[PDB]
Amino acid sequence: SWRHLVCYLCFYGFMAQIRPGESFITPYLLGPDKQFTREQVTNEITPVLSYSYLAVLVPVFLLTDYLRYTPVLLLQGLSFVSVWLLLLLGHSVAHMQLMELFYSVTMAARIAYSSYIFSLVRPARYQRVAGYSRAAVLLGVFTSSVLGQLLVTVGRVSFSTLNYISLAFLTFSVVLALFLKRPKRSLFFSVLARMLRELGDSLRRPQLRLWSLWWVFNSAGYYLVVYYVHILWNERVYNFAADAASTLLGAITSFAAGFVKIRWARWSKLLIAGVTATQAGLVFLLAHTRHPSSIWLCYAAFVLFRGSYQFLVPIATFQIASSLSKELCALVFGVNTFFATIVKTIITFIVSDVRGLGLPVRKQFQLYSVYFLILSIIYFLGAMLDGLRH
């Protein structure tokens, strides 16, 4: 328990993020093996993922606390294994839709890990473990992306061999998940009413409410910028370089966030306001760039934006866990993720849709920068009001 409780947890996160074939799923489907046209992939396969993610996430956060966080992690690993099995053995569109449903399950089942890190360790070590786990997860993502790109570009492996490597890594990740310490049954746990009442009582607290609003709104803006950053530049090797550098800086900043010594009652709002203002500036930098010999600055801005967000994420998770005097950390995590996805979808429908305020990608990023600026301004006003009522 001295090393294989935290070191093993970080290793499991790192190796569970290892999926070399994850970033090449769409080219694999649009390849000689699967022989799928663009129409089938674009508007018959990925819609299943987009429309099922929330439908899977809704029970996930309700069940992860009661079943404890180990079964949900094992389910996520098995769902990734099923995703890759369907990738290697699917022939029809229905198989790919089922694979995307399992992928939505996998993406919904990460709050289980994000809370399991807190459930394992004493509350006095919440900040460091939150940083360690996020650093390990982002290092795993970076390693998976770099390994896949190396295997497909400089290496001469096919998309099938890369997917076989990913399946082997997922099998090893499942084996690792099979040896995770399941926490105690917990005093907590209709039960729904109990968890809803506890969620309300805990949201009454100021430290949890402040970082839950950040999770709902800053993450929604983060995912809007990250998802639309690829279309903005495309409207190539350097794009993957920017993504990998962003992921590495995010891992470094998440690791550093577990060592910062800040009194999280007077400068918690100020830190959020400063980070959000910096993110607004970086998104404006990503938006207002049109010089051909300036893409290095755009990539640096994107890297710094992702680094700032992944620096504040472990702080948010540790502050939410420490402000919860109940085994409902994953319920709050999932509720925040669900509301962040709802806000992201709403902003996507407004800024990017024919029915809504239809705008090009550059105007979309300008709107995202304005949104981040509004969030920063709100957090600065909240910090000023909190400091005035000392």
UniProtKB/Swiss-Prot annotation:
Glycosylation sites: 35
Reactions catalysed: 5-amino-1-(5-phospho-beta-D-ribosyl)imidazole-4-carboxamide(in) + (6S)-5-methyl-5,6,7,8-tetrahydrofolate(out) = 5-amino-1-(5-phospho-beta-D-ribosyl)imidazole-4-carboxamide(out) + (6S)-5-methyl-5,6,7,8-tetrahydrofolate(in); 2',3'-cGAMP(out) + 5-amino-1-(5-phospho-beta-D-ribosyl)imidazole-4-carboxamide(in) = 2',3'-cGAMP(in) + 5-amino-1-(5-phospho-beta-D-ribosyl)imidazole-4-carboxamide(out); 3',3'-cGAMP(out) + 5-amino-1-(5-phospho-beta-D-ribosyl)imidazole-4-carboxamide(in) = 3',3'-cGAMP(in) + 5-amino-1-(5-phospho-beta-D-ribosyl)imidazole-4-carboxamide(out)
Residue ranges that the UniProt entry lists as topological domain Extracellular: 28-41, 90-93, 156-160, 288-293, 356-363
Entry membrane topology: Multi-pass membrane protein
GO molecular function: 2',3'-cyclic GMP-AMP binding; antiporter activity; cyclic-GMP-AMP transmembrane transporter activity; folate:monoatomic anion antiporter activity; folic acid binding; folic acid transmembrane transporter activity; methotrexate transmembrane transporter activity; organic anion transmembrane transporter activity
Keywords recorded for this protein, A-Z: Acetylation, Antiport, Cell membrane, Disease variant, Folate-binding, Glycoprotein, Hereditary hemolytic anemia, Membrane, Phosphoprotein, Transmembrane, Transmembrane helix, Transport
Tissue note: Placenta, liver, and to a much smaller extent, in lung.
Consequence of substituting residue 100 to A/D: Reduces methotrexate uptake
Effect the entry attributes to changing residue 344 to A: Abolishes methotrexate uptake
Domain of life: Eukaryota
Outcome of mutating residue 107 to T: Reduces methotrexate uptake
Cytoplasmic side: 65-68, 117-130, 261-266, 318-331
GO biological process, one term: female pregnancy
Keyword Glycoprotein: yes
Cell compartment(s), UniProt: Cell membrane; Apical cell membrane; Basolateral cell membrane
Function summary: Antiporter that mediates the import of reduced folates or a subset of cyclic dinucleotides, driven by the export of organic anions. Acts as an importer of immunoreactive cyclic dinucleotides, such as cyclic GMP-AMP (2'-3'-cGAMP), an immune messenger produced in response to DNA virus in the cytosol, and its linkage isomer 3'-3'-cGAMP, thus playing a role in triggering larger immune responses. Mechanistically, acts as a secondary active transporter, which exports intracellular organic anions down their concentration gradients to facilitate the uptake of its substrates.
Family named by the database record: Belongs to the reduced folate carrier (RFC) transporter (TC 2.A.48) family.
The protein, known as: Reduced folate transporter
